[PDB]
Amino acid sequence: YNPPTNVVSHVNGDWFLFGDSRSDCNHIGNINPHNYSYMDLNPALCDSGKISSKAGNSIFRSFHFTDFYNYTGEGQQIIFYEGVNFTPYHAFKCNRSGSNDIWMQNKGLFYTQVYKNMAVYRSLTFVNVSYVYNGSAQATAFCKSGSLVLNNPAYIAPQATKVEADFYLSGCDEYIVPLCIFNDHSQYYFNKDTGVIYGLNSTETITTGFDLNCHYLVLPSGNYLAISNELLLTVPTKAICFNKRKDFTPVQVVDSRWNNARQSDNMTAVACQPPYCYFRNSTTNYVGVYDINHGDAGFTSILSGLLYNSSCFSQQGVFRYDNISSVWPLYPYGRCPTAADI
Amino acid sequence: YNPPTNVVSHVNGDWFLFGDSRSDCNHIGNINPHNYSYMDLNPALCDSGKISSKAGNSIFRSFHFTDFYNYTGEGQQIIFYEGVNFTPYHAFKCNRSGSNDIWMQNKGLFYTQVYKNMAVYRSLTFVNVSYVYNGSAQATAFCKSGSLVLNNPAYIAPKVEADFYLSGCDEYIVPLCIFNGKFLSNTKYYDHSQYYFNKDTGVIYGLNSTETITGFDLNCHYLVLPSGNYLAISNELLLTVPTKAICFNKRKDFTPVQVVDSRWNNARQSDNMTAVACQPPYCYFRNSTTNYVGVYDINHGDAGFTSILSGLLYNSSCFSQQGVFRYDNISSVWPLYPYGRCPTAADI
Numbered sequence: 155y156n157p158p159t160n161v162v163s164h165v166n167g168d169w170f171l172f173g174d175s176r177s178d179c180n181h182i183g184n185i186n187p188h189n190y191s192y193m194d195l196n197p198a199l200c201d202s203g204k205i206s207s208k209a210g211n212s213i214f215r216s217f218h219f220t221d222f223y224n225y226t227g228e229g230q231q232i233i234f235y236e237g238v239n240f241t242p243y244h245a246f247k248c249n250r251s252g253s254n255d256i257w258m259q260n261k262g263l264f265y266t267q268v269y270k271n272m273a274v275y276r277s278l279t280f281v282n283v284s285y286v287y288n289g290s291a292q293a294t295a296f297c298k299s300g301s302l303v304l305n306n307p308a309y310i311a312p313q314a315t316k317v318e319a320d321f322y323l324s325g326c327d328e329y330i331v332p333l334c335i336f337n338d339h340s341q342y343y344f345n346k347d348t349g350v351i352y353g354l355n356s357t358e359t360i361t362t363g364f365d366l367n368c369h370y371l372v373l374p375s376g377n378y379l380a381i382s383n384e385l386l387l388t389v390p391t392k393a394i395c396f397n398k399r400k401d402f403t404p405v406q407v408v409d410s411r412w413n414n415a416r417q418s419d420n421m422t423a424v425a426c427q428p429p430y431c432y433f434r435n436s437t438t439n440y441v442g443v444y445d446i447n448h449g450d451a452g453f454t455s456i457l458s459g460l461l462y463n464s465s466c467f468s469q470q471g472v473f474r475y476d477n478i479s480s481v482w483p484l485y486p487y488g489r490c491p492t493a494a495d496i
Numbered sequence: 497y498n499p500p501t502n503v504v505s506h507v508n509g510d511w512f513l514f515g516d517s518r519s520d521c522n523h524i525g526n527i528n529p530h531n532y533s534y535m536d537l538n539p540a541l542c543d544s545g546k547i548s549s550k551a552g553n554s555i556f557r558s559f560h561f562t563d564f565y566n567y568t569g570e571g572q573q574i575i576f577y578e579g580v581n582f583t584p585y586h587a588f589k590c591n592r593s594g595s596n597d598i599w600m601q602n603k604g605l606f607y608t609q610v611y612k613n614m615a616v617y618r619s620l621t622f623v624n625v626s627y628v629y630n631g632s633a634q635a636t637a638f639c640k641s642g643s644l645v646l647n648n649p650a651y652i653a654p655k656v657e658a659d660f661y662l663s664g665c666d667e668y669i670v671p672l673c674i675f676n677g678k679f680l681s682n683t684k685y686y687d688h689s690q691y692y693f694n695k696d697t698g699v700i701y702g703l704n705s706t707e708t709i710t711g712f713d714l715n716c717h718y719l720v721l722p723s724g725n726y727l728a729i730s731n732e733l734l735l736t737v738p739t740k741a742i743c744f745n746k747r748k749d750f751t752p753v754q755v756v757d758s759r760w761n762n763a764r765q766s767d768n769m770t771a772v773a774c775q776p777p778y779c780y781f782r783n784s785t786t787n788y789v790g791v792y793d794i795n796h797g798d799a800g801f802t803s804i805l806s807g808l809l810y811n812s813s814c815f816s817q818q819g820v821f822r823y824d825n826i827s828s829v830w831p832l833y834p835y836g837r838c839p840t841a842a843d844i
């Protein structure tokens with residue numbers, strides 16, 4: 155009896171968690187009353203030095219908006235428990251005429267690149283992208299909804315019939331940058347070292363509004379050039395920074411959603427696929443004790459696997475022991491049991 | 497005893513092999529004496545319906561050149577035993593001051609896409625890519641060496657552009673290439689420059705040239721694209737456009753492919769580009785520990801590789817970096833990046 159269990163865990167001590175208030179030990183200082191029941195993470199892991207988490211935030215939210223947290227962490231086995239802090243609930247769009255679906259599509263495309271690459275790099279952090287433009291027209295902040303203000307990519311208008319800007323990716327093995335457009339102007343990023351050109355022409359669509367479509371390029375270091383044919387130019391101000399190549403190690407991603415009253419999405423589930431990712435989810439509504447949206451038994455149970463080492467990680471779940479079981483593990487990592495007759 | 501064995505094999509009947517003369521059951525017709533000793537494949541498999549192979553050819557060779565074979569096959573587990581038919585032995589380059597190194601770079605990048613994608617598609621074949629160019633110039637063939645004449649991408653020379661279409665597949669591999677370095681024109685130097693543009697998604701893929709350490713030849717990138725209506729655009733005098741594509745069909749659960757090293761006898765220079773292309777988790781690389789010494793002639797019918805292919809004569813439970821474990825119950829080593837039903841190395 156060694157069943158596949160619905161938890162995130164680790165083979166050894168070499169792991170790292172990226173999360174939000176539900177695993178942010180520092181949030182307790184900002185709330186009254188002061189206790190840890192808002193967390194799904196067990197408080198014994200607070201001192202572990204293996205968690206980079208921030209209340210109200212997500213990796214995607216930090217990537218695109220001024221509400222920035224510098225998520226930073228290193229490990230062989232990466233675990234994610236965030237994403238909810240940019241959801242349909244927030245109803246983000248650039249204008250009144252925008253579309254939240256475009257932004258849900260972006261969320262899904264972004265996290266796909268995060269997960270794929272964190273299966274091959276130990277280290278994730280942010281860097282500020284140095285960009286230079288001689289057409290000093292400032293940035294406008296041309297995309298706002300409530301307290302969410304877009305600052306990556308930056309907008310540049312022309313001031314002192316074609317606009318360009320230089321940017322520089324440095325210090326990391328590989329970087330994610332956003333390349334975006336509103337769905338008649340084109341947008342190119344050009345690597346001057348390699349000669350590779352990435353671009354986006356604008357084209358209409360039938361079932362959406364009018365908002366910023368982003369693609370997330372996984373780029374090398376180099377001296378780049380952002381170019382545009384018409385008036386507006388978009389350029390990266392932030393990048394996910396990948397370091398320290400490792401043997402392929404699937405990441406673990408926990409479903410980050412609200413209580414059913416608020417509207418959530420399944421874009422991290424879409425992004426999380428085999429062989430690079432295992433998706434864990436409770437079989438219940440998120441019903442928190444601190445408030446309705448924080449401190450749930452189902453998700454506390456999933457995260458409880460971080461309190462011990464486990465042998466084998468599979469699509470069905472985690473097997474603690476490496477010898478025998480009654481189910482064949484799919485897409486395994488670690489020392490895995492057989493389910494043959496012996 | 498259940499060790500990781502050095503063979504290519506299959507979990508069940510659902511498999512397919514892509515290869516060359518060393519698994520070409522026809523060809524016996526075109527040689528004298530008529531003996532199957534030239535193959536590393538076992539003749540018993542000749543009527544399996546699961547081999548697409550052609551003597552003298554390789555997938556990369558058919559992709560790029562006039563010497564075309566329509567490689568075609570479908571299976572959950574895919575095995576490749578080809579590649580040697582484009583090697584430094586052939587010493588290909590376009591012009592006088594060309595570079596084979598560039599074409600090995602090209603080889604490595606092509607097979608990287610082939611193996612990655614045959615991990616997630618059942619069916620592989622070739623489609624001809626039809627293109628419309630409205631100028632007077634023809635698709636001329638200026639880049640060849642021996643009996644190898646480049647026909648993909650095409651090469652048009654009178655801003656010039658041409659339509660092209662990707663139909664018949666879920667996804668396609670097409671070449672986007674340029675010549676390295678800056679070409680001269682009326683004192684002023686200019687950069688080689690080619691874009692492809694999807695008119696539906698709006699995505700623009702492009703290449704411009706740069707200075708890199710002599711050896712001026714065609715640098716290709718191999719884009720994995722969806723069906724749609726495309727535009728090939730040039731900012732230089734010359735236009736390049738895809739004439740063939742690798743055609744992927746029938747999405748499948750992730751199933752690592754198996755690649756067998758394809759080299760010559762050591763008297764001829766081979767390359768390791770398929771090894772570089774074959775990496776975990778999407779590919780397992782099998783190679784013998786000896787020099788290729790063939791029996792029909794020096795380059796055909798080797799013991800080491802005949803041994804590796806013999807695993808196709810039976811079903812095997814578990815596939816891993818170290819090799820194929822036949823049985824799914826118990827073993828002495830822990831399988832790395834396993835596929836199938838794998839044994840434990842634990843003490844019961």
Ligand SMILES: *[C@@H]1O[C@H](CO)[C@@H](O[C@@H]2O[C@H](CO)[C@@H](O[C@@H]3O[C@H](CO[C@H]4O[C@H](CO[C@H]5O[C@H](CO)[C@@H](O)[C@H](O)[C@@H]5O)[C@@H](O)[C@H](O)[C@@H]4O)[C@@H](O)[C@H](O[C@H]4O[C@H](CO)[C@@H](O)[C@H](O)[C@@H]4O)[C@@H]3O)[C@H](O)[C@H]2NC(C)=O)[C@H](O)[C@H]1NC(C)=O
Binds near residue numbers: 622746
């Ligand atoms: C070299 O020779 C080979 C062999 O003669 C030639 O190979 C053939 O190439 C042609 C293209 O020239 C291919 O046609 C296309 O096939 C696609 C796939 O069709 C099959 O799969 C479809 C979907 O399968 C999925 O669903 C089923 C459930 O129903 C599952 O079983 C399966 O697992 C999948 O999940 C099936 O619907 C279909 O019946 C086939 O089984 C098609 O998608 C493709 O359609 C395009 O064109 C259509 C117009 O006819 C149009 O309707 C569509 O819009 C679409 O754009 C098209 O039919 C052959 O598949 C291919 N055969 C083989 C054996 O490889 C090759 O052309 C030749 N090359 C040269 C250069 O000469």
Ligand SMILES: *[C@@H]1O[C@H](CO)[C@@H](O[C@@H]2O[C@H](CO)[C@@H](O[C@@H]3O[C@H](CO[C@H]4O[C@H](CO)[C@@H](O)[C@H](O[C@H]5O[C@H](CO)[C@@H](O)[C@H](O)[C@@H]5O)[C@@H]4O)[C@@H](O)[C@H](O)[C@@H]3O)[C@H](O)[C@H]2NC(C)=O)[C@H](O)[C@H]1NC(C)=O
Binds near residue numbers: 414415435437438
């Ligand atoms: C992760 O896990 C959770 C739990 O398994 C998944 O939650 C389900 O999410 C799907 C997709 O969004 C929902 O599908 C909707 O179903 C609606 C009708 O469903 C009724 O039937 C269910 C009983 O068979 C019942 O559970 C459900 O009520 C639930 O939500 C109520 C919220 O007001 C709450 O009062 C109840 O306590 C109960 O929890 C409904 O009566 C349908 O109208 C929609 O169109 C849509 O199809 C499921 O309902 C969700 N189920 C639960 C229990 O929350 C979640 O999708 C998983 N995440 C990912 C990313 O896959």
Ligand SMILES: *[C@@H]1O[C@H](CO)[C@@H](O[C@@H]2O[C@H](CO)[C@@H](O[C@@H]3O[C@H](CO)[C@@H](O)[C@H](O[C@H]4O[C@H](CO)[C@@H](O)[C@H](O)[C@@H]4O)[C@@H]3O)[C@H](O)[C@H]2NC(C)=O)[C@H](O)[C@H]1NC(C)=O
Binds near residue numbers: 762767768783786787
């Ligand atoms: C598949 O398997 C076969 C056998 O396992 C394997 O064959 C080996 O290939 C390599 C590379 O072609 C050969 O390596 C050479 O070995 C000799 C000594 O016998 C060395 O002196 C050579 O040294 C070179 O590299 C040095 C680096 O410091 C240079 O200084 C020097 O100038 C030389 O160029 C060279 O490495 C090896 O002999 C064969 N062995 C056999 C038994 O054939 C093949 O490489 C494998 N294929 C792949 C893709 O891995």
Ligand SMILES: *[C@@H]1O[C@H](CO)[C@@H](O[C@@H]2O[C@H](CO)[C@@H](O[C@@H]3O[C@H](CO)[C@@H](O)[C@H](O)[C@@H]3O)[C@H](O)[C@H]2NC(C)=O)[C@H](O)[C@H]1NC(C)=O
Binds near residue numbers: 629630657659
């Ligand atoms: C070369 O000249 C031909 C003229 O024969 C140009 O043909 C044009 O091709 C485009 C793209 O296929 C056609 O547009 C398409 O129209 C259909 C239906 O209207 C639509 O379904 C497609 O989405 C697309 O919009 C266009 O009609 C056609 N023009 C004519 C006059 O027939 C072609 O553009 C030229 N190619 C180059 C590279 O200059």
Ligand SMILES: *[C@@H]1O[C@H](CO)[C@@H](O[C@@H]2O[C@H](CO)[C@@H](O)[C@H](O)[C@H]2NC(C)=O)[C@H](O)[C@H]1NC(C)=O
Binds near residue numbers: 166167461462
């Ligand atoms: C899981 O295994 C790891 C080894 O990778 C253990 O980590 C060690 O924990 C002790 C504390 O008792 C430290 O002194 C070591 O420095 C740790 N090493 C590393 C690499 O973190 C960990 O204790 C194990 N967990 C459990 C619950 O036994």
Ligand SMILES: *[C@@H]1O[C@H](CO)[C@@H](O[C@@H]2O[C@H](CO)[C@@H](O)[C@H](O)[C@H]2NC(C)=O)[C@H](O)[C@H]1NC(C)=O
Binds near residue numbers: 221222223282
């Ligand atoms: C990169 O950019 C961010 C955002 O502007 C900088 O974050 C600010 O840093 C200052 C000084 O540490 C703080 O006072 C602010 O509170 C920070 N803002 C936020 C939203 O966190 C960051 O300093 C920059 N980092 C580097 C290395 O240049």
Ligand SMILES: *[C@@H]1O[C@H](CO)[C@@H](O[C@@H]2O[C@H](CO)[C@@H](O)[C@H](O)[C@H]2NC(C)=O)[C@H](O)[C@H]1NC(C)=O
Binds near residue numbers: 226279280281282
């Ligand atoms: C996020 O935090 C990390 C971790 O401190 C920062 O990493 C430092 O980056 C600088 C270069 O700007 C290096 O010289 C340091 O050695 C790095 N680490 C430390 C501990 O000093 C990273 O720059 C931060 N990113 C942002 C956008 O603020």
Ligand SMILES: *[C@@H]1O[C@H](CO)[C@@H](O[C@@H]2O[C@H](CO)[C@@H](O)[C@H](O)[C@H]2NC(C)=O)[C@H](O)[C@H]1NC(C)=O
Binds near residue numbers: 189443445
């Ligand atoms: C931590 O404090 C919170 C207060 O927010 C406590 O939450 C209570 O949970 C129980 C569950 O039965 C309810 O009876 C209360 O109504 C909850 N109060 C609120 C405001 O949500 C929680 O019990 C405390 N836990 C510890 C260990 O101190």
Ligand SMILES: *[C@@H]1O[C@H](CO)[C@@H](O[C@@H]2O[C@H](CO)[C@@H](O)[C@H](O)[C@H]2NC(C)=O)[C@H](O)[C@H]1NC(C)=O
Binds near residue numbers: 564
């Ligand atoms: C794709 O293009 C190739 C051009 O090489 C076609 O193959 C040739 O077809 C002609 C006419 O049947 C034959 O006489 C030649 O022998 C073929 N050449 C080679 C190298 O095999 C092929 O028929 C085209 N396929 C489709 C479906 O149009």
Ligand SMILES: *[C@@H]1O[C@H](CO)[C@@H](O[C@@H]2O[C@H](CO)[C@@H](O)[C@H](O)[C@H]2NC(C)=O)[C@H](O)[C@H]1NC(C)=O
Binds near residue numbers: 475477478843
């Ligand atoms: C598989 O491994 C587990 C993990 O050690 C074994 O569990 C032990 O089983 C013995 C039976 O004699 C118990 O007394 C111990 O309490 C268990 N130890 C632990 C640490 O859980 C299990 O027996 C092994 N199964 C087989 C068939 O070899």
Ligand SMILES: *[C@@H]1O[C@H](CO)[C@@H](O)[C@H](O)[C@H]1NC(C)=O
Binds near residue numbers: 248250295
């Ligand atoms: C979109 O938002 C920007 C500022 O975020 C604003 O300048 C602009 O007026 C808005 N668009 C429309 C159509 O009002």
Ligand SMILES: *[C@@H]1O[C@H](CO)[C@@H](O)[C@H](O)[C@H]1NC(C)=O
Binds near residue numbers: 287320
């Ligand atoms: C902006 O001007 C500086 C010199 O003042 C130059 O070095 C830089 O490359 C310019 N950027 C662009 C995009 O032209």
Ligand SMILES: *[C@@H]1O[C@H](CO)[C@@H](O)[C@H](O)[C@H]1NC(C)=O
Binds near residue numbers: 384727
């Ligand atoms: C792409 O959009 C630009 C507008 O900036 C336009 O000039 C061009 O015509 C479009 N692409 C093509 C292939 O026509």
Ligand SMILES: *[C@@H]1O[C@H](CO)[C@@H](O)[C@H](O)[C@H]1NC(C)=O
Binds near residue numbers: 420423424
């Ligand atoms: C995500 O939700 C969409 C809603 O239409 C659904 O079609 C899709 O199957 C879902 N994907 C996953 C991975 O849950």
Ligand SMILES: *[C@@H]1O[C@H](CO)[C@@H](O)[C@H](O)[C@H]1NC(C)=O
Binds near residue numbers: 497823825827
């Ligand atoms: C596993 O069981 C099978 C019987 O079908 C056979 O290979 C052998 O008995 C077992 N393996 C070993 C190594 O004993």
Ligand SMILES: *[C@@H]1O[C@H](CO)[C@@H](O)[C@H](O)[C@H]1NC(C)=O
Binds near residue numbers: 531532533791
């Ligand atoms: C074919 O060649 C092999 C290798 O020399 C030889 O042993 C065998 O006898 C040959 N078969 C026939 C039918 O001549």
